[PDB]
Amino acid sequence: DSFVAHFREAAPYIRQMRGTTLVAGIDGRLLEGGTLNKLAADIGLLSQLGIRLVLIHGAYHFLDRLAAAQGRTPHYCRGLRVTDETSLGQAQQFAGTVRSRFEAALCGSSVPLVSGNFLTARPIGVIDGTDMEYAGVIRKTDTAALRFQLDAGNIVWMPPLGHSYGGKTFNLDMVQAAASVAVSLQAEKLVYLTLSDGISRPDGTLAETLSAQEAQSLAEHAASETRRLISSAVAALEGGVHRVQILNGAADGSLLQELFTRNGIGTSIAKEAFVSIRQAHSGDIPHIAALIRPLEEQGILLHRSREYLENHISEFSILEHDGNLYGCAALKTFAEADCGEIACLAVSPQAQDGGYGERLLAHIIDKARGIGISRLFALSTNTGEWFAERGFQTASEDELPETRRKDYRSNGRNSHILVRRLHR
Amino acid sequence: DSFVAHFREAAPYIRQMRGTTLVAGIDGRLLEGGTLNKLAADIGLLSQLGIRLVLIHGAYHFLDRLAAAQGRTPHYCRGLRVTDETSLGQAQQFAGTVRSRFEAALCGSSVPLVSGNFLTARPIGVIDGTDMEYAGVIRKTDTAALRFQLDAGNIVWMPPLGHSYGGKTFNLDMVQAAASVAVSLQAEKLVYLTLSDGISRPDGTLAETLSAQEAQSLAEHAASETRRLISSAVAALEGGVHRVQILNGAADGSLLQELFTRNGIGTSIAKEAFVSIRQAHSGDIPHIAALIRPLEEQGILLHRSREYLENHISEFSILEHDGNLYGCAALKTFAEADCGEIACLAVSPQAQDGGYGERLLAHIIDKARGIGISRLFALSTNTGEWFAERGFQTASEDELPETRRKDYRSNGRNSHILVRRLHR
Amino acid sequence: DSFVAHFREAAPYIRQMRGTTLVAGIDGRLLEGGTLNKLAADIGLLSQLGIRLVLIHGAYHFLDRLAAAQGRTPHYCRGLRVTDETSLGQAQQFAGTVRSRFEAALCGSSVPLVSGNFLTARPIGVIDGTDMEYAGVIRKTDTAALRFQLDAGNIVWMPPLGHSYGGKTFNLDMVQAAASVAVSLQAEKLVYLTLSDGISRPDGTLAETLSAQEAQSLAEHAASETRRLISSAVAALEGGVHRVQILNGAADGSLLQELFTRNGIGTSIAKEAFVSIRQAHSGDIPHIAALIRPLEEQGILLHRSREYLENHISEFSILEHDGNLYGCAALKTFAEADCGEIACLAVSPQAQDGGYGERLLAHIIDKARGIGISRLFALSTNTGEWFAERGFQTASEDELPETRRKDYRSNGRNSHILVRRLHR
Amino acid sequence: DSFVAHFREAAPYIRQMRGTTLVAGIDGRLLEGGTLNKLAADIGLLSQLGIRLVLIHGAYHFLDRLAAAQGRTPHYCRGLRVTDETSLGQAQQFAGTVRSRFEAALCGSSVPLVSGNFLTARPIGVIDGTDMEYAGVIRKTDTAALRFQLDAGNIVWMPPLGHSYGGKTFNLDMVQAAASVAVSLQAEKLVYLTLSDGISRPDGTLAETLSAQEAQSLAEHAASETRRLISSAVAALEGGVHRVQILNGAADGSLLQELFTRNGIGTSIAKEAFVSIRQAHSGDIPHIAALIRPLEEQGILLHRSREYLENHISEFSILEHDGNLYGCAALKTFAEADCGEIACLAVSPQAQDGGYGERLLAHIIDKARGIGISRLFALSTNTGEWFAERGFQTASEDELPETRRKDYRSNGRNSHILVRRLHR
Ligand SMILES: CC(C)(COP(=O)(O)OP(=O)(O)OC[C@H]1O[C@@H](n2cnc3c(N)ncnc32)[C@H](O)[C@@H]1OP(=O)(O)O)[C@@H](O)C(=O)NCCC(=O)NCCSCC(=O)N[C@@H](CCC(=O)O)C(=O)O
Ligand SMILES: CC(C)(COP(=O)(O)OP(=O)(O)OC[C@H]1O[C@@H](n2cnc3c(N)ncnc32)[C@H](O)[C@@H]1OP(=O)(O)O)[C@@H](O)C(=O)NCCC(=O)NCCSCC(=O)N[C@@H](CCC(=O)O)C(=O)O
Ligand SMILES: CC(C)(COP(=O)(O)OP(=O)(O)OC[C@H]1O[C@@H](n2cnc3c(N)ncnc32)[C@H](O)[C@@H]1OP(=O)(O)O)[C@@H](O)C(=O)NCCC(=O)NCCSCC(=O)N[C@@H](CCC(=O)O)C(=O)O
Ligand SMILES: CC(C)(COP(=O)(O)OP(=O)(O)OC[C@H]1O[C@@H](n2cnc3c(N)ncnc32)[C@H](O)[C@@H]1OP(=O)(O)O)[C@@H](O)C(=O)NCCC(=O)NCCSCC(=O)N[C@@H](CCC(=O)O)C(=O)O
Fold first, then answer.
1. Chain C residues closer than 8 Å to A124 by CB
2. Residue C312 CB partners (closer than 8 Å, separation 6+)
C-alpha cells in the first residue's frame, strides 16, 4: 500500500501506545551483528513515539558459549543457571560490551539512554541440593527512580545484574527479571524478544492470541524453554501487566509490526479476569427482579412480571460475584431461525463501568451463536449508542421478526433498532 | 581530638561544599581491591553531604597491562594512547566490570547512581604521522541531561567512552575528559584521584597550594605523567572551574581530608585572574583625583590636594584595566618603623564587588611587608567592618603612631581604628 | 581518633538522618550566653546535613525569674503555668529577643531561617478551680505551611506562642507544643534540649535507652519536671514519632554526639508496638500447620507431621493478632548444651515485611538465652541472607551438633548453615 | 453610592494591583490600639486581592519614648538615630511584641504570614564625629528567599533589624529600609504609612500627585521629617519602583481608598524619565526627512517636500536621545482660533513602543494649549485607534476647519477624523 495508507493504519496504535510503559526482555543473541543495529533503530523510533521504554537483556547464551568453548560445562536447576564467581565476572564484562554497542547503535540511528543501580538482589540459594551461587532474584526494584527517568523521557537500560546489601553482585534471569520489573512499574505491556516466531499450538501453528489459561494449557506439552516464558508471562499478567508478547527479535521489523498493525506477527497473551456467568434458575428471580424493577420503573426496560420470569427463566443469564447478582441478560428466539434478541440487559449501577455489560453481551452472543443465530437485534430507548459502539447497525422496524415488529407497534415506544451479524 | 571537635572543624567546609558540583577523575587502579570499597564509602558520604558528584574513570593502566601480558605493546603519541579495535573491545569490558564493582561497593556501604550516553566523541585522528584509531575526544557533552540528574540528587558515573554519529565507540583519555566535562558543568571543583600524593616542587616537597602560573612553571622540569595533569588542570581553570585538586586515591581518607579540613593533604591549584597593579606616576593623578573626589566630597576620604598627590605619588598604587583606572590605595609610613597605614583605599562603584578592594589591600600588604612593616593601621568612618572581616582588630587612638594620633585629634572625625599584624 | 575515622563513623548516621524531620524543644535558658552560639553552630550544621529542622523554645524559666525578682509569684497547676496578660506581654518580648539573638548567632556561624503564624491556640481554661488565663494549647497546626518551608530547606523557628480566632495570643508550654507539632509533622525524631544529662534510672545511672513502657514506669518515682517530659515523649511516640530524645543542651556538642555516634550521650525513648508472642499449645496446631504446609510444599521447610507437632509443641512459639496466627518459630535443643537452632521460622505472606520475622527471631533468642544457649544455628535453602543480615556467620556442616550434622547428610538438601553467638 | 457601584469602581484598580508587589513602610505608632486592628483588616484583604505584600515597621518613636521617660536622651545625626546596645535590646523586644500583636490582629480578621533572616546589616559607622553604634544599613537583601515566599502567597513581615557576619544585630531606619527592599524586589509600589495626610505644597494644600522633581523641590523648605521621606521616595523611584505613596495610617480606610479609588486621599510620587523634546530648527530637517520618508513612502504620511519643511519648521517638535532623532510631530493652526491639528506624528520603529508616541502627543497638546487651542484634530488612514485610546472622538469631515475639509476632499484618502478637547 501507500505510505499514507500505512501511517493511517498505525495511527490508532500509536494513540494507544503513547505514554504507556513497555518493558522489553531481550535475548542477548540479538545484541550482536546487523540485528542489533535494527533493534536500536526501532527502539529509537518507539522512544520518538512517546512510549516509555525499559530494556533488560539476557546473558545465559553468551555465558554458556564462553563456558563450553573454554572447557567448562554450565548446569541448570529448575530452569535457573548456576553462575560461579567467574561466570559472574564475565557476565559483568558482557553487560559493559552490550550496553556500549547498543549505545553506539543508537547514535548511528539524540535519543537519551540511562542506566542505574535500580535492582537489589538476593541469592537464589540452593535448589534441589545444588548451590546456585551467584544466581540471584530481584529483591527490591527502585520503582521511584525508574518512573522518575521514564517521566523525563529517557530510555532505561538494565543489565541482568542486581546487587546485595552485602556488596555482592548477582546474575539475574532476564526472563523472570523482565516480568518482575514490569509488574513493579505496572507496565501496560511486557514484550519478550526471542529467536522464535512465538508460541506454537500443538498443531505446529503459531498461536496468534492466547489467554493466560490457554497459554498455561500449552505449557504441559511444551519445551522447557517456552515453559519458563509462559510462566513468567502468566506471572506478569496476574501481577498487573495488561499484555505480554513474544516475538522473534531476528525477524526484521517484527517489533514495529507487532505494535502498530492490526494483525501483528508473533503471539500475545492476556488475562481476562474471571466473572461467573451462568443460566438463571428459579432462585435468581427475586435478585433479577430487584435489579430490573428500578429500570422498568424508569421505562428503560419493558415490564416483566414475576410470572413471565418464572416461565422464561432459561432465556436468562446472570452475572454474579460472591453469590451476589450484578447483571443479567436474555436471549429471545423467533419463528425466524436466523434471528435472536438481546433483551433485558442490565448491570447494577454500583458494578457498572467495570466491563460487566460487555461480558453479558458477549456471553449471549456465544449462546446465540451456538443455536445457529446469525442476526442479533437490540431495541432500546436510551442506550442505542452502546450497541453502535459494539458492532451494531441501526435497523428499521420492517426488518424485525414479525412478532417483534408487532410488539414494536403496540409498545408505542419507538425504541431504536440495532442489528449485529454473528459469524461461523 | 574529640568527635565533636572534628565535626565542628569540617562544618564550614560542608557549608561551602554543599550544592556545589564536584567532578572526579579516577585512576582505574583505584577501582580494584580494598581501596575501591573505601572510595565508595567516602563518595557515598559526599552524596549525603549534598555535593553533586560526577565520576569518570581511567582505563589506560588496565589496557596497558592486558597488552604487555597478552603479547602486544601499547604506544603513546603526544601523551595520548593508540587504542585499536581490540583495545576498545576490552575497554568496554573493563568499564562494565568497574561500574558494577563500584555499584556493589556502594550498596555494601541507598545512594542513587546513574549513567547515560552523555558523551559524544570524534576520533583524535592522526598524531605526528601515527593513526590513533579509536582514541577519541569529547565532541559534545550532554550538559542538560547531566544537570537534570545532578538536580535529582543522583551520582553520575561515566566510563572513558563516548560515541560518534557514525555508530562507533571511542576510548577517551580520562584526564582530558574529566576536565572537559567539568568545564561544561562549570563545576566549582575538579579532583583528580591519582596514585601520588600530589605535585612536588623542585625541592622534592609536596606543593600544598599552587597558582595556575606556579603550576605551569613546574611542568617544564616535570615527568610527562604530571605534565599532562597540569595542562588539564590549567585548562580546566581557564575554562571556568574554581579549583582543581590532585590527591592520592590510595591514601585512606585523603578525599575526606582534602575536602573537610583546613590543611588538607595533597595539592590544589587555582587561577587568580590577572589585574594590573602598579606604582602610581605623575599621569594617574587626574584619574586618581577623579576617583577620590566624590568620596572626599562625601567625607569618607580625607581631602587630598592635587599638590599633596604630586609629592606623595610614590606612596600610591593604582589598579587598572585597559588603561582605565578602577582603584587606588596608599601606604603611609612613620617614625615608628613597624607601622604602616592603608590610606585612600577606593574602588569605583562600577567595578566594585569584583574583588578589586581585596587586591589593593593585599598589594599594599606586600609593599608594607617588603619594608619591614608588621603593624598596619586603617582608619575610616563608614567602612571599618570590611577590615574586621579581613584580619583587623579594632584599636585605640593611644595606639596609633604619634603623628597619626595627633591628626586624629585635630580631624574631629573619630574614625574607627583597626590594626592587622603582618608576618615573616 | 583521626578526623577520617570520625567522619566515617558518623557517615551511617548522616545517611539515616538525611531528609528526615527533627523537631527540637529548647529550654530557653540555653538561648543566653556562650551556649547559644554553639547551639546555633551545630544547628547550622544539621541544616547543612540536610535534616529538616523545626525549632520551638520555652519561656517558663525566664518569666518565672522576671516574676519573683519584680515582686510577683508564679503559680502552676497540673504542671501548666498561669500566665496573666502581663506574663503574656513579656513572653512576646522574650520571644523577639531570643529569635533575634539566635538569628545573629547563626550568621556569626547563609543558613535560611523562617517563622510564621503556624500555630493557632485556644485557652487551657480552668484547672482544678484555677483560671489559667493566657495559658493556651495548640488547637490547629498549619502543617502544610510547615512542610512547604521544610521542603524549601528552611529552618523553622517557633516561639511558645499561638493565636486564637478572637485576636488573642496565648502562652504555650514548650514541652507539649514540641510534641504536638512533631506529631503533626509525623517527624521521625523529637529532641528535647534540657539542662540535664537525660533521664536517670532509680539507681542514679543515666538510662541510655528506654522503651515507652520502661520510661512510663520511671515516671511514678520521678521529679514532676521529668514526669511531664516523659508523658510528652510517650505521647509523641504513640502519635507517630519514631524516636524522642532527651539531652543536656549545656553539654557542649551533645547534640552532634547524640545524632552521629553509635553510643551517644543522653537518653532515647522509642515505642515498640505490641505483638503477642507465646508458647504454642495443642490448639494452634491446625493454624501452624496451615501456615507451614505451603512452605514445606515448596521445599523451604522440612516436613513436620501433625504427630511431630503434637509432641514437640513446647518448642514452638506463635505470633498472633486478634486470635489470628501470623507467624511461628521453633527452638531446637541438643546433647551439646551450648547449641540451639531456630527452626520452622515462618510468617504469612500477608503479614510479611512488617517486622514479624525479626520479632520471632528475637523472641526465641531470649528463650535460647534463658537456657544457657550461646551458639544458635539456622539452616535454610533460600533464606540464608536474612540471617547474614541479622548477626549470623556462615558455618560448615562439621560444626553442627552431631545429630544435626547427621540429618544434614541424609536430608540431601545442602541447606546453608549460619551461626550466631548469644551473650551474657 | 451602592455597593455594586463601589465594587465596579475598584475593579480596574484590583486588576492592576493584582500580582504586583507592594512594600509597606509602617510607622510603629500605628501598631498599637484600635488602629492596628484595622490595618490588619485591610492588609488581610490586600492579600486576598492577590497583591504580594512586604511589611517593614519602624521603631524610632517607641525607643525615643522609652528613652526620655526612663531618663535618657536620644540623639540623631544626619537624620539617623544613635542606638546603643540597650536601645538595640529593647528594639528587639518591641519587634517581638508588634509582630505578635499584628499576627493576632490578623487572625481576629487564615492569611499566611512569614518572617525570616532576609536582611544582613553593616553598621552605619561614624557620622560627623559621632559613633552611631548599632545603627545599621542593609548590606544584603535575600531577594530570592523573599520572592520565593511572595510566590507562595505569603505575607512577608520584617522588623527594622538586620544582622552582620559577625553575629551582631543592628537597628535599621524603617524609611530607608523600606526603600532598599523595594528596590531589590523591583516592587511596583512603595507605600509609606505615616501619621500625616501626605506631603503638603507650600500653600498648605495636600499635593495629590507629584513628580520626583516637583517633590525634590518641596524638600528644601520642608520639615526634616518629610525631607528624609522624599529622599527615600526619590531614591526608590530612581532605583526602579514605579510609584511611591505617602498616607496617613491613622486615617481609617485610607489604604483601601488610596489603592482602589480614582482620586485616592494622600500623595503619590512617580518619576517620568527624561526625554528631550524641543522645537525643530534648520538642522533636524535631514533627520526628520529620514524618519518620515519611509512613512510617506507607505502612504501613511502626506508627502512633505524639503521646501515645505524649511518654511514650516517652527510647527515641528523633535524628540531626541544623545543627539539622535527618534520622533517628531507637528502642530498645525487655522483661521479657526480654537482648532489645532497633530500632524506628521512619527516614531522610529526601533524606539517605538517605549512611550515616545505619548510624549510627543502630550508635548504638542501643551503647545496647543498654550495658544488658546481647545479642539485638536488628527487624521490618519491606519492609526485612528491609537487616538481613540488616548482621548479622541471620531469626527465627520464637515467638522474640520474649512481649509482642512478642502484638502480632505482633494486628498482622496478618506483618512479617519478624530478630535480631542483641551481644557483650562
Ligand atoms: C448499558 C449497560 C448495560 C452497560 O453496563 P456496563 O457499564 O457494565 O458495561 P460496560 O462497562 O462494558 O460499558 C461502559 C461504557 O458504556 C457507556 N454507556 C453506559 N450507558 C450508555 C448509554 N446509555 N449510551 C452510550 N454509552 C453508554 C459508558 O459510558 C461506559 O463508557 P466508557 O466505555 O467507559 O467510555 C448499563 O449501563 C445498564 O444496565 N444500563 C441500564 C439498563 C439499560 O439501559 N438496558 C437497555 C439495554 S437494550 C435491550 C433491552 O434491554 N430493551 C428493553 C426494552 C427496550 C424496548 O424494546 O423498547 C428490554 O429488553 O426490556
Ligand atoms: C570598601 C571598598 C574599598 C571595597 O571595594 P571592593 O568592592 O572592590 O572590594 P571587595 O569586592 O573585595 O569587597 C566586597 C564586599 O565588601 C563589602 N563592603 C563594601 N563596603 C562595605 C562597608 N562600608 N562595610 C562593610 N562591608 C562592605 C561588600 O558588601 C561586599 O560584600 P560581599 O563580600 O560581596 O558579601 C569600596 O567599597 C570603596 O571604595 N568604598 C568607598 C571608599 C571607602 O570607603 N574608603 C575607606 C577605606 S578606610 C582607609 C581610608 O581610606 N581612610 C580615609 C580617611 C578616614 C579617616 O582617617 O577618618 C583616607 O585615607 O582618606
Ligand atoms: C524470611 C521471613 C521469615 C521473614 O519474615 P518477615 O518479613 O515477617 O520479617 P522481616 O520483616 O523482619 O524482614 C523483611 C526483610 O527481609 C527480607 N527477606 C525476606 N525474605 C528474604 C530472603 N529469602 N533472603 C533475604 N532477605 C529476605 C525482605 O526483603 C525484607 O527486606 P527489607 O528489610 O524490608 O529491605 C519470611 O519471608 C518467611 O516466612 N519466608 C518463608 C519461610 C522461610 O523461608 N523459612 C526459612 C527459615 S530458616 C530455618 C528453617 O526454618 N529451616 C527449615 C529447613 C531448612 C533446612 O534445614 O534445610 C526448617 O526448619 O524446616
Ligand atoms: C503610532 C506611533 C506614533 C506610536 O509611537 P510609539 O510606539 O512611540 O507610542 P506608544 O509607545 O505610546 O504607543 C504604543 C502602543 O500603541 C499601539 N499602536 C501602535 N500603532 C498602532 C496603530 N496603528 N493602531 C492602534 N494602536 C497602535 C501599540 O500597539 C502599542 O500598544 P501597547 O499600548 O503597548 O499595548 C508609531 O507607531 C508611528 O510612528 N507609526 C507610524 C506613523 C503613523 O502612523 N502616523 C500617523 C499619525 S496620525 C496624524 C498624521 O500624521 N497624518 C498624516 C496624514 C494622514 C491624513 O491626513 O490622511 C500626516 O500628518 O502626514
1. 382
2. C330
